[PDB]
Paper text:
Mutations of human CDC73 are associated with hyperparathyroidism-jaw tumor (HPT-JT) syndrome, which is an autosomal dominant disorder characterized by parathyroid tumors, fibro-osseous jaw tumors, cystic kidney lesions and uterine tumors. PAF1C participates in recruitment of histone modification factors and promotion of transcriptional elongation. To understand how the CDC73 N-terminal domain contributes to CDC73 functions and how CDC73 pathogenic mutations may lead to HPT-JT and other diseases, we have characterized the structural features of the CDC73 N-terminal regions and revealed a previously unidentified N-terminal globular domain. Here, we demonstrate that CDC73-NTD can form a well-folded globular domain, and is conserved from human to yeast.
Based on sequence conservation and the size of trypsin-resistant fragment, we generated new plasmids and purified both hCDC73(1–100) and hCDC73(1–111). There are one and two molecules in each asymmetric unit for CDC73(1–111) and CDC73(1–100) crystals, respectively. The overall structure of CDC73(1–111) is almost identical with CDC73(1–100), with a r.m.s.d. of Cα positions being 0.894 Å. Both CDC73(1–100) and CDC73(1–111) fold into a globular domain. Indeed, our Thermofluor assay showed that hCDC73(1–100) and hCDC73(1–111) have Tm values of 46 °C and 56 °C, respectively.
Residue numbers in the entry: 3 to 100
């Protein structure tokens, strides 16, 4: 699963290459909008479909982790990238950083 690959690359600081709409991990590649297996907070409940974070959304959080979460939310809105919702933030960053 691509989120486990992203964890591995992030923890060992191995280069991740973004090229147009593609993300390259070593000699492997995924579309940037590939769905991870991480269900978005609030979805999959009250009869509404599960939705999953895209790889792009997670990379954008990682690249902007220095911001306070509210300012990051504004940056995601401005860049038209889905936000990682606050209830998912600590767990996702914990998983990605080990």
């Amino acid at each position: 699963d691509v989120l486990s690959v992203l964890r591995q690359y992030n923890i060992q600081k191995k280069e991740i290459v973004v090229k147009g709409d593609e993300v390259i991990f070593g000699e492997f590649s995924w579309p940037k909008n590939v769905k991870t297996n991480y269900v978005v907070w609030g979805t999959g409940k009250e009869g509404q479909p599960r939705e999953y974070y895209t790889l792009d959304s997670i990379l954008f959080l990682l690249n902007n982790v220095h911001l306070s979460h509210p300012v990051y939310v504004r940056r995601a809105a401005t860049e038209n990238i889905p936000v990682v919702r606050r209830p998912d933030r600590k767990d996702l960053l914990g998983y990605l950083n080990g």
